[PDB]
Structure 1
Amino acid sequence: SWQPPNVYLETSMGIIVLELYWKHAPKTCKNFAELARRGYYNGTKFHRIIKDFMIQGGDPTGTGRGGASIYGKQFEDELHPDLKFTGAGILAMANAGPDTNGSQFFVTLAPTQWLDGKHTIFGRVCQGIGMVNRVGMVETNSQDRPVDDVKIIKAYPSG
């Protein structure tokens, strides 16, 4: 199967090496690796950008509620205790509701334990947490997106 430990993502803010939680969520890590291989999360703008809470990119719809994953239609969020949205550099999926998650990746530098139970964490940001914190510090509009659009240039799912 596809169980990469860490992947790389180069964008306009910089290059970040993010670990994947394939030990607790192997199916979500395989879906994220297949979306990075197919370029589903590459080139899509940041749909959701909270005020220094969680910055979500790679959503193909761009409104923060749509998007398609590698498993087909919507992916069920199977949260685990080893991969929780807590601390700094937590990688998860910005799901609006339960059992509906796409291929978008959200980096959180703050505590998100309230949304940790309703979403499956893809992994952790081993490198480039400062770039995600600088991207999430920009002011956004009421639709969780600023006037300028920031996307992902390249994605390498090595492993």
Structure 2
Amino acid sequence: MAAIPPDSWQPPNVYLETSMGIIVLELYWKHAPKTCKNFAELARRGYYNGTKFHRIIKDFMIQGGDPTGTGRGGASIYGKQFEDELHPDLKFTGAGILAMANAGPDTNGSQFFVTLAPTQWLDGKHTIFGRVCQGIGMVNRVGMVETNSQDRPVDDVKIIKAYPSG
């Protein structure tokens, strides 16, 4: 009853070609279409290309830059700030996840942090957006490496290019 000859697959995987190492991510095109489009657009337009990770907490997580890495010049495709895409369903405990960073009520930025270690205390503080199925290993080393006495990476980690799977 009513058959649609044509079909649509759409690659739900993203390939971030970082200087540190290549890692695949999983975007939620169901509840995350909003942030998903932003993350994909920013990477497609050529914003993430050239940036790097400034925040790296040993045995915890590592947040990547975007808004000039200093809140100097950063804006979302939809606008400056939007409504948080938080929805009771995901969790930030399983080592290797991609949660969208925020600032305040109805105030979201363009940062992204991947949790490499179990965290229940912060399980709810930030919002989700993607996952790291194939790549957590590359991130693990980034946390095991030598860091500063605050949150500065002693090693060299940056992004050279990024493209979605085809």
TM-score over 0.5 for the pair: yes
Q: Deviations over 1:77-132 (max 9, x none)?
A: 32223333221110013435454332232211112344342322121012111001
Q: Secondary structure at the match of 1:141?
A: coil
Report the CA distance between 1:39 and its aligned residue.
Answer: 2.0
TM-score normalized with structure 2 length: 0.78
**CA gap 1:53/1:27 in 2 versus in 1, 3 angstroms:** same
Report the CA distance between 1:72 and its aligned residue.
Answer: 2.1
Report the CA distance between 1:56 and its aligned residue.
Answer: 1.2
- Structure 1 stretch displaced more, 81-90 or 142-151: 142-151
Report the CA distance between 1:60 and its aligned residue.
Answer: 3.2
Q: Using the alignment, how far apart are the partners of 2:64 and 2:85 within structure 1? A: 20
Q: CA RMSD in A?
A: 2.9
**CA gap 1:80/1:48 in 2 versus in 1, 3 angstroms:** same
Q: Is the 1:44–1:60 Cα contact (8 Å) retained in structure 2?
A: no
**CA gap 1:12/1:68 in 2 versus in 1, 3 angstroms:** same
Displaced runs of 4+ in structure 1, greater than 6 A? none
TM-score normalized with structure 1 length: 0.81
Report the CA distance between 1:64 and its aligned residue.
Answer: 7.5
Structure 1: stretches of 5+ with no match in the other structure: none
Q: Secondary structure at the match of 1:154?
A: strand
- Structure 1 stretch displaced more, 90-99 or 7-16: 90-99
Q: Aligned pair count? A: 159
Q: Secondary structure at the match of 2:160?
A: strand
Q: Is the 1:83–1:121 Cα contact (8 Å) retained in structure 2?
A: yes
Q: Deviations over 1:56-89 (max 9, x none)?
A: 1132332489843333223433222333322111
Q: Using the alignment, how far apart are the partners of 2:103 and 2:133 within structure 1? A: 26
Report the CA distance between 1:154 and its aligned residue.
Answer: 1.0
